[PDB]
Design a protein around this ligand. Sequence first.
Ligand SMILES: Nc1ccc(Cl)cc1N1CCN(C(=O)[C@]23C[C@H]4C[C@H](C[C@H](C4)C2)C3)CC1
Length: 248
Amino acid sequence: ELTPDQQTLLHFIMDSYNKQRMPQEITNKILKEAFSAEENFLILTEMATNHVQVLVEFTKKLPGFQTLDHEDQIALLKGSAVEAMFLRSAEIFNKKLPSGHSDLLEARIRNSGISDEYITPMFSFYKSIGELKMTQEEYALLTAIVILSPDRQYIKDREAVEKLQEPLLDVLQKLCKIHQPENPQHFACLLGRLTELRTFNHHHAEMLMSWRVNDHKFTPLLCEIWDVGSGSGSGSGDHQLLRYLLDK
Ligand SMILES: Nc1ccc(Cl)cc1N1CCN(C(=O)[C@]23C[C@H]4C[C@H](C[C@H](C4)C2)C3)CC1
């Protein structure tokens, strides 16, 4: 059972996590669009861009996130985007889409000019995440914990970040007791898939280097948050788009 303050915190998180969905225009493209590598790749690009917009809105409302330095805010956004995208896509693929949407979406991902050395880890992770059979609250807390990670590059005040991250980890452990009482190692399997999740930072960096992927013009938002051509760092002047979205 949760403390009053853990319950307040959990309700803040859930209210922000739920204000976030995939737009019907994007969902309909999975059926509507022609089936070619170029059009499949552009659907994935539109999903990634929407993922990032949603991630930014969620991030802004994490309790205490607004009390960090603007440059550290940028550094948490940049550092967590890839992991938060793969965690959210796993939720979508396992829990939100009808089975027909999920089957077709997978076919389009497998036929978008991305090499199979990046695809199969993605889907192996999706299956490994799905067998844990997580509730919405576990996805929401795990995403908050990924975002408020005191280990990202360019954070000036890591103690401020760890102090926000520590109460979310307590809540998560209790939630695993409450919703998975049969399995007392559930919490450890969750954090174990955090380890698998971080491997996608390197997979993704490799993917952006691929010659297929560079035959392509990313969206404004993806170029900024993934440093596609940009410079790396968290300087305020170097991320006007992110600052704009952060300031609402
Ligand atoms: N966004 C989403 C929602 C549901 C499901 Cl089943 C899968 C996904 N993707 C998995 C994560 N992704 C990517 O890594 C991408 C990585 C690079 C740059 C973008 C275009 C593609 C090449 C695929 C984003 C987007 C598609």
